[PDB]
Each structure stands twice: as structure tokens, then as C-alpha cells.
């Protein structure tokens, strides 16, 4: 019953090297609504990322989707960095493609 973000990282399509895709970072179940969500490639924030309008689920906890069009490259590491006042330090969620 903690208000920390529960985070999932996934692509719109099952990934294949060189094929256009969308990378998603979905955070949910958190409170307060202020939250930092950054999609990263090799530790560099990804260009073109967009964030959904703030919304919430039935128990009033908040959720937010961050997504970026991208072409996955082999050898790179994609991840989502999340910061929230319920967390003592940032948490990093790797994409397992």
C-alpha cells in the first residue's frame, strides 16, 4: 500500500533491429502526481519523447505514459529513469526487448 511508481518498459511492436518502433515507459499507482520519467538510449535522453495527459485509476492513484518513436539498434541499451518523492534515489528500468 505504498504510493511509489510501478513501472513497465515495452515497445509497441516486438522489436527487430533496424525496424521502426515506439518505446514506452508506463508508470502507475503513484501519488503525488508530480513525477519525472525519462526514456534514455545509452544514458542519453531520447529525442522526440512525448507524455500522456495526467490521468488516474479507480483507487485514485496516478498514471502516465511516456513514449518515443525510435529505431532500435543492437548493442545499445534503452532504459527509463524515474524520479518521484516516494523514492530515495532515481530508479532505472531497462528495456528487455
Amino acid at each position: 500500500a505504498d504510493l511509489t511508481p510501478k513501472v513497465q518498459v515495452y515497445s509497441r511492436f516486438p522489436a527487430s533491429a533496424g525496424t521502426k518502433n515506439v518505446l514506452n515507459c508506463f508508470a502507475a499507482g503513484f501519488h503525488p502526481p508530480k513525477i519525472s520519467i525519462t526514456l534514455m538510449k545509452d544514458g542519453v535522453p531520447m529525442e522526440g519523447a512525448q507524455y500522456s495527459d495526467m490521468s488516474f485509476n479507480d483507487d485514485w492513484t496516478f498514471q502516465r505514459l511516456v513514449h518515443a518513436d525510435f529505431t532500435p539498434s543492437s548493442g545499445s541499451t534503452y532504459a527509463c529513469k524515474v524520479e518521484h518523492e516516494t523514492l530515495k534515489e532515481p530508479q532505472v528500468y531497462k528495456w528487455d526487448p
Binding site: 513497465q8 515495452y10 503525488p32
Partner: protein, 275 residues
Amino acid sequence: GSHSLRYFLTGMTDPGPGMPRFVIVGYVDDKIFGTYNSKSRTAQPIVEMLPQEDQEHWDTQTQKAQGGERDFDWNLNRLPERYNKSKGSHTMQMMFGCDILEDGSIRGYDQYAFDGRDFLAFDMDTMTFTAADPVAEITKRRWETEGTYAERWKHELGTVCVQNLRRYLEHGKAALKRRVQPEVRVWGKEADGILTLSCHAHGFYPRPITISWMKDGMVRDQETRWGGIVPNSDGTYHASAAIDVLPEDGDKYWCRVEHASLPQPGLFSWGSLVP
């Protein structure tokens, strides 16, 4: 059939740098149909679902959302003093809408929360209220004695919401009736003599889906972990299920996926290819 219209309103004293302090997201049947925010100050349709909307309807939505924004701004300034918890950031939320059930009957919803906790709710079937704490109780008692709120929201939920739902179902039918079949990937990762199998369904619509793990024809629901249904940005959805198994049994487990787009369930296994 059965259909739902829902509005999710949020006001924040501390939204984050550059973020709007007030936001509304509207849903028809698990599909976002329009939004409002205090930066743009405009209610706008999602044009991929509603591509031919008249201006007057959305000016009316904008006028109502602007009134909501002002009310949320007042509450965020005033409720903290009434709770004697002035410091810190604060939030106000409301969810309301309507269902048209399979038999044609109507159901209304109207609930509020402050700082993420139940505040008050309104029952449009009986035109009564309930409140979760003494601050909300004072508001509730004033509203019910005056009688204006209940008449307004019975009409809002039971007439306007229903009419708008029927409108959006008709105007957005092309997007709503569409079925997108999921693409499924099965993956296995072994560690410490345990093989974790995972099954991910990518990009399906509509939202309802089931994922199960099966062995010897028998479902293994007690051993399965589900990640939950989560959205893609194009209006489709994603879902997952995982199970821990002995490495020597990896190729005996099958992930079963049921979805409206699949006349019979899909069945996928680790170590096999699907041409």
C-alpha cells in the same frame, strides 16, 4: 451493446515544471476521445477517433472544462485550510460519467477525492450523496439541503452524458469497431536453476484479453504472475504473464492468448517458431 463514458479530472498545486495544473481526460469504452488542460485552455477531440467534429460541440466542452478548472483552483486553495494541513502539495480529483447497459438502462458515476483520498460521491439513481470525512460532510449537507447540485448532476449524468456517449459512439464508430490482433512473443531467462517464461501480447484492440500458461493441457493460474494491461500511444494495449518452471520443462509450457480479434486462442511456446 454496453458502453461507457468517463471523465478523469485532476488539479494539482505542484504538477511539475512546465506541466499544467489542471487536466481532463475523457474516455469512451477504453479509448481516449478528448482532452483539456489549463495550458491550452481548450477541450479538443482526439481526431484519429473523431475526425469530423463540429466546433460548437467542443466550444461547449471547453466552457464546461474552464468552469471545472476554476472550481478545482478554489478547492485547492481552500480545502487545505479546512483540514488544518496547509503545508505540502495538494491534489483534487473527480471521476464522473455514465454507462448505457446492454438492456439500454443507464448508470451514472460522480465521485471526488482530495489528496488522493475519497471525499464525496453522488448517486444519480436516488439523488443522494455520501461523504468520507467531516470536512466533506459539511459540503455534502449544504449541497443536499440546497437541492441545486442534485438536480444539475442528475441531468448532467442521466441526460447530457448519455446523449454525448451516443454521439461519440456514432461519430467514432470506425475507430471503435476496429479489431487489432496482438503480436505475441514468448521469452525465457534461466537463473539459479529456475527458468522464468514470459509471454507478452503486443498491440491489441479492444482492451479485454486473457493470457494463461498451460502444461499437459492444464492451466497453471496459481503459479502465474500477470503484468497487467497497459497502453500504447496509438490506442492499442499491451499485456504480459510470467511463470517459473524447471529448465528441463521449458518446451512443455504453452502461453494461451484469447482476444476478440482471434477466432480461436493463440498458443505459443518457448523454443518454437511460428511461420
